[PDB]
Design a protein around this ligand. Structure first.
Ligand SMILES: O=C(NC[C@@H]1CCOC1)c1ccc(NC(=O)N2Cc3ccccc3C2)cc1
Ligand SMILES: O=C(NC[C@@H]1CCOC1)c1ccc(NC(=O)N2Cc3ccccc3C2)cc1
Lengths: 464, 464
């Protein structure tokens, strides 16, 4: 990795564009005015990409050669980068202040600030905008995952009277549906801030190395079938495939994809009649989890439940909702996103089915179908010192008031009613509010403050 | 990187689910049913993750320890992975056949096939589905980028009499808007299959290391301003910022963001009057590129052009379309995706503005706002050998005929009219359609066929 080649190309030319005699460039990140966001992911970026000796004579030469060809011109700040290598042994003269990870903050508040600690390195603040702005991704995954936990919590509490098994009800199926191995690890770790069920194993190594848990692992899985594992038996032997799989995993929960040919036939005739004897004997700690994987997600879930309810002994819980026997559950793992999860739980509640009957598997909807536009994650310069005088800077485009940026030095505070407020123009210096919630997390090539994954989970908890 | 921890968790349990005495699992990839797709990205995955010694005693132990805790059970195939380490010095006994990279293939055709070359490793074919299915991302970026090139080519040919500068008209601004550094390099490289303009620096190193070009670099950029380099001068000094930037880059093209406060005032009064003398003197090889970055993308482009048309000497080209002087161009870099690019070029053509006047910058729309569902990229088992007998395997869900998979051994052929056909059930063995278009690209830990980035570009060319 070469930090000199890890920026938007045009940033290579910005050192020549700032006002002459600029000694400070101060910038901030916010999710411009999903009412609240989970702040998560910065610690990973700081350790993997920004800390320690990030500049070497070889990295400077490599960048110089690439940029000469890329711009067809010598525009690269070799002097500037050589200064960092010589004065600081290649350590970044930058200070980053951030809200603690796992913190749940309303939209439109400062989440982190960046500034150079050496006047010569005024250009460095925004050089690293590209790498830091990528924090949008774990923030958005964590936020969108927490918003789904709120929906699940609400419906589980309404239909069952409690939150038992809430943290296993949204399972990450997104490993293949994501853009890269690195995204897989980041995205899966962000979902684990809220839940404990994952098949995206890449998330486990990321948490272990960069955050850490008291428990051996942050997430769990159960054996489950795939279409290859069912269809390999041949179309006439679906019942043999099912019998073999449930017999191999007789003492643990086992998920079995049942839509290879006809989901409704598999539920009614195969599980409900032919193999019913192998299901009703299962332990409560080892249910069969039937998995449909096609069709309209709500219509399929409802039809599968109506079939199962007629083949298996259903009870009515204390809330008046229908509950399958404990050795039998359902998992909807196709086309689940925040909108369809809401339609399913609401449709189940309308048909008097408890949310304890189901779990959801989400792939692309959980880790890939998200953009930087969803929470309007943006990094902008708000303060500069030129000719020794500090000036409050901002953008305010005439056609879009939503793109107006904050002015001056910023601080994040608790209001008297316990909400959040971002003070602008260095007004945090007046001791009118409590202490600034932004803490130094990075300074001069060193990570100064770290959070464990356990602290992050605690910070990200739902109120209920 | 540990390939034993680079799969969906449930795949760890599949070796116990296949019919006993299975010696072969044969699977394929397709973009089920954007009528045609650019096949690109497999070579990167083969080299970075699949080739050479991918199994060690340490990797086996690491995976064993993680899975023991992750499943709260021992289900990990330690014996199977030890067999690969001992028999093949940790090299994967797998054969992968693929269509040449850069090839443009209609939807619903076999793109690549995977099979084990050792009977003991029947479970390996689908273990690596997760890593290979991630090919969806460079395929979709390359395809969506090529679809945008088709729109640009059509309107540029209609409004001017040619395609001059086509490969510089869609510039990648997506570095900050992607989910990770790895995604940035993959995605930017896929856009470079069709275009030559990029700010996502990460793409260059990927192409150099994994594909290669005759030219020193596959993509180019020009100096450009950002809001921080304009706004740092203070709200009353936007003219001073502009004058300094264009004087610093007087002999190369320079992009200048002009919407910090009022885009229309900046075009009419600042560029159009105050600084007009510094613009009209610029070389044809060094235009000023005005950059709006807010408001309705089409309305803003049209109003900016109407303003410039009244302040600068506009000509009428041979097709009857309006053309700015050669020292002046526009770049629309906000909210550009395939839909808005289409609306802008059509809106410009309706107002008699040539497409030579504009270039587009696309961030999230080009590299992030894409999912595996867009081209229905899917990997499925189509053939197995059990007890020495080959059987044609497929899924055919009752509620979704679109999810029905192909049967048996597959081959890709040219039809008599020069189109494509995927033959199923080993029918390629009949010499009725000539030779199979898939080639062995990987066999037993080695990459057996590779393509340069220049061959890929040639294969991906538009007919026009
Ligand atoms: O219900 C479940 N959990 C809640 C509780 C926990 C203890 O049991 C109840 C459950 C858990 C996992 C699964 N996994 C699968 O179905 N996969 C995994 C995966 C990955 C990628 C693609 C496809 C698939 C199919 C299913 C149900
Ligand atoms: O017009 C252009 N090219 C066509 C021809 C080629 C030779 O010159 C004409 C052109 C090229 C680059 C740019 N770059 C920018 O505006 N950036 C870069 C970037 C990155 C990330 C976020 C924001 C921005 C703003 C502008 C215009």
């Amino acid at each position: 990795f070469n930090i000199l080649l890890a920026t938007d190309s045009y940033k290579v030319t910005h050192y020549k564009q700032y006002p002459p005699n600029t000694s400070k460039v101060y910038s901030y990140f916010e999710c411009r005015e999903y009412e609240e966001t989970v702040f998560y992911g910065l610690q990973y970026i700081l350790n993997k990409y920004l800390k320690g000796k990030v500049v070497t004579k070889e990295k400077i030469q490599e960048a110089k050669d690439v940029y000469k060809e890329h711009f067809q011109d010598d525009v690269f700040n070799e002097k500037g980068w050589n200064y960092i290598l010589e004065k600081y042994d290649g350590h970044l003269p930058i200070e980053i202040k951030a809200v603690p990870e796992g913190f749940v903050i309303p939209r439109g508040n400062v989440l982190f600030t960046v500034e150079n600690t050496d006047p010569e390195c005024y250009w460095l603040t925004n050089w690293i905008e590209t790498i830091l702005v990528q924090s949008w991704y774990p923030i958005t995954v964590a936020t969108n995952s927490r918003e789904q936990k709120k929906i699940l919590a609400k419906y589980l509490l309404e239909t069952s009277g409690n939150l038992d098994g809430l943290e296993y009800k949204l399972h990450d199926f997104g490993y293949r549906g994501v853009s890269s191995q690195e995204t897989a690890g980041i995205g899966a770790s962000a979902h684990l801030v809220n839940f404990k069920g994952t098949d995206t194993v890449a998330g486990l190594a990321l948490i272990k190395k960069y955050y850490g848990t008291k428990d051996p692992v942050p997430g769990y899985s159960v054996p489950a079938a795939e279409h290859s594992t069912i269809t390999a038996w041949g179309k006439d032997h679906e019942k043999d495939a099912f019998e073999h799989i449930v017999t191999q995993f007789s003492s643990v929960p086992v998920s079995v994809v049942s839509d290879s040919y006809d989901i409704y036939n598999a539920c009614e005739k195969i599980w409900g009649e032919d193999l019913r004897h192998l299901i009703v004997s299962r332990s409560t700690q080892a249910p069969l989890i039937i998995r449909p994987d096609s069709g309209n997600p709500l219509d399929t879930v409802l039809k599968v439940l109506e079939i199962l309810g007629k083949k298996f002994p259903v009870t009515e819980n204390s809330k008046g909702y229908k509950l399958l026997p404990p050795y039998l559950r359902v998992i909807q793992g196709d086309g689940v996103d925040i909108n369809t999860l809401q339609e399913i739980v609401e449709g189940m509640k309308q048909k008097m089915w408890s949310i304890e009957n189901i779990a959801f598997g989400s792939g692309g909807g959980l880790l890939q179908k998200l953009t930087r536009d969803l929470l309007n994650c943006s990094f902008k310069c708000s303060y500069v010192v030129t000719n020794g005088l500090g000036i409050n800077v901002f953008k305010d485009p005439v056609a879009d008031p939503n793109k107006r940026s904050k002015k001056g030095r910023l601080s994040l505070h608790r209001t008297p009613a316990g909400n959040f407020v971002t003070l602008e123009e260095g007004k945090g210096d007046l001791e009118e509010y409590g202490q600034d919630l932004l803490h130094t997390v990075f300074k001069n090539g060193k990570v100064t403050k770290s959070y464990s994954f356990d602290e992050i989970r605690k910070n990200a908890q739902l109120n209920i």
